[PDB]
């Protein structure tokens, strides 16, 4: 079976077999589609076709399909789970595995850049102190002083599930958040359940706007413990205006450093609930979500009143102009300090043509457009013509449940 | 089998029923979504024009009525006889309020239910076509307080006497393919354009030319007519800050009216259903202005503005578009015409679909069609989950005439 996608500003025509690969569910059927919902132990049984299916296509990758070194592998990996219950990948086997589950990423648009990927392998870390040293060398290694490197750090996988290896927090660093007693919110809204687990676990909160969290990290299934990442490797930009002089004294920075700790990475069947990565930002992630969503740091009012724009009508499009400059704002401090960032229109564009390069030689590249449009301008960017088809491809970066709605506590 | 959707900047949670109702396919499987794609006899028809006749009555309290019974009845029999049936003028109005209802890509529709609907099946002739147009036109525009509106020609019998619209909205502008390589008006319509000329038109070939109607009665062929200018309702774009925006030259019509879809009701269909409603400004001033296969304006308006365009970075694109979308709303304002910011319709669909989960049980929508071309996640749609899925009666696409057409 093929199927076509085309832009609708271009008539480029491309022809998907990908997605005959794809094995996983989607959460649509003919009847309904759920392209728009956020989110729609494991047995000897299920686990050897795989370990068979991502070692076929590992060694495919490699041009070795079939040869004795295929088939001694495959042998190794069959005695080895049979014997076991589960097996362990080879280095090689690790740094492609990481590596393609990125690309298959179907939400992320920075997938270009999949292939320069620093895999660190943490496999024979026991401990929260092992994982804090990993993961301060993830972090300076990454941040490169401004000059940004992918990189993603993988401890032990999963066994029983009772063992398990996570990074309490959802990036490795992010602003608290604070409820206040007058129902307010101090510092980053969206972190004030992760903020309050902190405290009770012992963290003294300094309770300014742009706290740096600190690390919350579980070793072997057992409680998570509490690190300050060196604040000399959390590199940070002051946000300015290149126009707007008064911008500055809004008080607002960001972290150069996005790196998302809360996925589970699964290869072969085999599953790492504990994997942080990292690339760099798109501008919109700080000047749009970040900054401007209602729930978030919310700072459109405050930006059009120092703006003077006309805020007695949404048709004065007040919202979207301070948007604007915002973005524009975040975009210049990043560059001015020479921290790597990309806007909106370049990522997009890199896209488009990755994708493309992805039709024909890999003869398909599942997108999610909800996720790859940009959050604002979307029809002024290529993606936003452009027809995506969104299947689930393995090895892949999965959601997993928070840690402190499933974790044992043992005292 | 019960779908929650959540809106994840308010946690309201909000649980579908409605879909299991469903009929029609998505075009997406378990394997893959296609949520991005733009397009994805007697027997067959009783059970079609019955799953109508169902909704109809409940929809009036009166499901399992002997009036029910005998309705159901009597078109069972004339199906039987005739082939098909014909629709009540009060089915008729409650079926087009209905397919609109169900539009998942409308964002519009809190307005659903005030629908005026015209009944044009007596029609048999283009002119007769064109009349009924023109008064739909005067009647819509409302001189600038607009009014939505549907004129429905004969239903489909043999696919042979169809009616059809060919222009895709009833009041488009030209588009010309110059000699030097580029294209002067609407290049949307460089096609459409050209099939007017060959049968006749005289264009003056300008960047704003209001395109004629091509009207196609009973399977015959199509006939051209200019709708009055009168009745042609336009407003010049200003800037309410920028003096030199009016140099630009743009302009653009009140009415939207998209002719070129199919009304299929209880299993019948009406291949000619132009309606209209008032326009969202961004449709104008991102899609029809800055589109790059539109009137593409971005780049004339940032070295207007004397932006830095040398880098993407400086978000000079992004700058212009929110001009360019101000003077729209700004223009149609000043002049008194109907028009919506892409924050007050959403909103408005927001609570819409409140009203819709709690008295209907849902509300299909596309995603991907309701979230404005702009500034996407500061208007509440974008954190609002939709299910996607077909409801009938319904609008759908269907081909181009000029493809089908047994000259
Ligand atoms: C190098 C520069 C990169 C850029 C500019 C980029 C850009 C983005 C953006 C804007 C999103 C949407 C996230 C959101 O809005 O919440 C995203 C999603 C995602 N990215 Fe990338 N990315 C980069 C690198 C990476 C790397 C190194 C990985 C993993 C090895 C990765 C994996 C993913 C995954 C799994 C998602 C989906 C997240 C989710 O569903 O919550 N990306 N990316
Ligand atoms: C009265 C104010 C209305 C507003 C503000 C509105 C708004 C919109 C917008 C912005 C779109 C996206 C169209 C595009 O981007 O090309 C749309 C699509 C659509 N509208 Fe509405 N609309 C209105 C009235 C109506 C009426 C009266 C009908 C029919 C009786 C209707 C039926 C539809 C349908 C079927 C679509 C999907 C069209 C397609 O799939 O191409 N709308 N609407
Ligand atoms: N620049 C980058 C690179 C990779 C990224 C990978 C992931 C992300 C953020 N994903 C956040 C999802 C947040 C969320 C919140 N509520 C419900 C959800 F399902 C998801 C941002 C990234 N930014
Ligand atoms: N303001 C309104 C109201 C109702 C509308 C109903 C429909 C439309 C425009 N739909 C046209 C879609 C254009 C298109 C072009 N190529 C392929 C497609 F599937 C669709 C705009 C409307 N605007
Ligand atoms: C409801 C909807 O799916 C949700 O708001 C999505 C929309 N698209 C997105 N796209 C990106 N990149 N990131 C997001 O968080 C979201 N949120
Ligand atoms: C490729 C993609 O499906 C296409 O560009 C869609 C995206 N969303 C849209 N949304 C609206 N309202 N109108 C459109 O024409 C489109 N086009
Ligand atoms: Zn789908």
Same mark, same amino acid.
């Given at each position: 079976?093929?199927?076509? &996608?085309?832009?609708?500003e271009?008539?480029?025509?491309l022809?998907?077999?990908?997605?005959?690969?794809?094995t996983?569910?989607?959460?649509?059927?003919?009847?309904?589609?759920?392209?728009?919902?956020?989110?729609?132990?494991?047995?000897?049984?299920?686990?050897?076709?795989?370990?068979?299916?991502? *070692?076929?296509?590992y060694?495919?990758?490699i041009?070795?399909?079939?040869?004795?070194?295929?088939? %001694?592998?495959?042998?190794?990996?069959?005695?080895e789970?049979?014997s076991?219950?589960?097996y362990?990948?080879?280095?090689?086997?690790?740094?492609?595995?990481?590596?393609?589950? #990125?690309?298959?990423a179907?939400?992320?648009?920075?997938?270009?850049?999949?292939?320069? *990927?620093?895999?660190?392998?943490? $496999?024979?870390?026991?401990?929260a102190?092992?994982?804090?040293?990993?993961?301060?060398?993830? &972090?300076?290694?990454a941040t490169?002083?401004?000059?940004? $490197?992918?990189?993603?750090?993988?401890?032990?996988?999963?066994?029983?599930?009772?063992?398990?290896?996570?990074?309490?927090?959802?990036? @490795?660093?992010?602003?608290?958040?604070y409820?206040?007693?007058?129902?307010?919110?101090?510092?980053?809204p969206?972190?004030?359940?992760?903020?309050?687990?902190?405290?009770?676990?012992? #963290?003294?909160?300094?309770?300014?706007?742009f706290?740096?969290?600190?690390?919350l990290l579980?070793?072997?299934?057992?409680?998570?413990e509490?690190?300050?990442?060196?604040?000399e490797?959390?590199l940070?930009?002051?946000?300015?205006?290149?126009?707007?002089?008064?911008?500055?004294?809004?008080?607002?920075? #960001?972290?150069? @450093?996005?790196?998302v700790?809360?996925? *589970?990475?699964e290869?072969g !069947?085999?599953?790492?609930?504990?994997?942080?990565?990292?690339?760099?930002?798109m501008?919109?992630?700080?000047?749009?979500?970040?900054?401007?969503?209602?729930?978030?740091?919310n700072?459109?009012?405050?930006?059009?009143?120092k703006?003077? @724009?006309?805020?007695?009508?949404?048709?004065?499009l007040?919202?979207?102009?301070?948007?604007?400059?915002?973005?524009?704002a975040?975009?210049?401090?990043?560059?001015?300090?020479?921290?790597?960032?990309? %806007?909106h229109?370049?990522?997009?564009?890199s896209f488009?043509?990755?994708?493309?390069?992805?039709?024909?030689?890999?003869? !398909?590249?599942p997108?999610?457009?909800?996720?790859?449009?940009?959050?604002?301008?979307?029809?002024?960017?290529?993606?936003?013509?452009?027809?995506?088809?969104?299947?689930?491809?393995?090895?892949?970066?999965?959601?997993?449940?928070?840690?402190?709605?499933?974790? &044992? #506590?043992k !005292?």
């Amino acid at each position: 079976r093929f199927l076509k &996608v085309k832009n609708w500003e271009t008539d480029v025509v491309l022809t998907d077999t990908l997605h005959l690969k794809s094995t996983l569910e989607t959460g649509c059927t003919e009847h309904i589609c759920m392209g728009s919902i956020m989110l729609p132990v494991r047995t000897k049984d299920q686990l050897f076709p795989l370990a068979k299916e991502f *070692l076929d296509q590992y060694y495919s990758s490699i041009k070795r399909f079939g040869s004795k070194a295929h088939m %001694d592998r495959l042998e190794e990996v069959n005695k080895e789970i049979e014997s076991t219950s589960t097996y362990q990948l080879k280095d090689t086997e690790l740094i492609y595995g990481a590596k393609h589950a #990125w690309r298959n990423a179907s939400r992320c648009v920075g997938r270009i850049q999949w292939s320069k *990927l620093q895999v660190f392998d943490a $496999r024979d870390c026991t401990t929260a102190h092992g994982m804090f040293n990993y993961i301060c060398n993830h &972090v300076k290694y990454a941040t490169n002083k401004g000059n940004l $490197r992918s990189a993603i750090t993988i401890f032990p996988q999963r066994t029983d599930g009772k063992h398990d290896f996570r990074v309490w927090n959802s990036q @490795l660093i992010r602003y608290a958040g604070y409820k206040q007693p007058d129902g307010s919110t101090l510092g980053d809204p969206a972190n004030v359940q992760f903020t309050e687990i902190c405290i009770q676990q012992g #963290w003294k909160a300094p309770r300014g706007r742009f706290d740096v969290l600190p690390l919350l990290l579980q070793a072997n299934g057992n409680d998570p413990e509490l690190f300050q990442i060196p604040p000399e490797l959390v590199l940070e930009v002051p946000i300015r205006h290149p126009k707007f002089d008064w911008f500055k004294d809004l008080g607002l920075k #960001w972290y150069g @450093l996005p790196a998302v700790s809360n996925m *589970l990475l699964e290869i072969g !069947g085999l599953e790492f609930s504990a994997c942080p990565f990292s690339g760099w930002y798109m501008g919109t992630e700080i000047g749009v979500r970040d900054y401007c969503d209602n729930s978030r740091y919310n700072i459109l009012e405050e930006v059009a009143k120092k703006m003077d @724009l006309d805020m007695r009508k949404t048709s004065s499009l007040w919202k979207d102009q301070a948007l604007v400059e915002i973005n524009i704002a975040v975009l210049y401090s990043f560059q001015s300090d020479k921290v790597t960032i990309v %806007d909106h229109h370049s990522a997009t564009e890199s896209f488009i043509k990755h994708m493309e390069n992805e039709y024909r030689c890999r003869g !398909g590249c599942p997108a999610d457009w909800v996720w790859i449009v940009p959050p604002m301008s979307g029809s002024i960017t290529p993606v936003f013509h452009q027809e995506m088809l969104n299947y689930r491809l393995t090895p892949s970066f999965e959601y997993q449940p928070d840690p402190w709605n499933t974790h &044992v #506590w043992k !005292g």
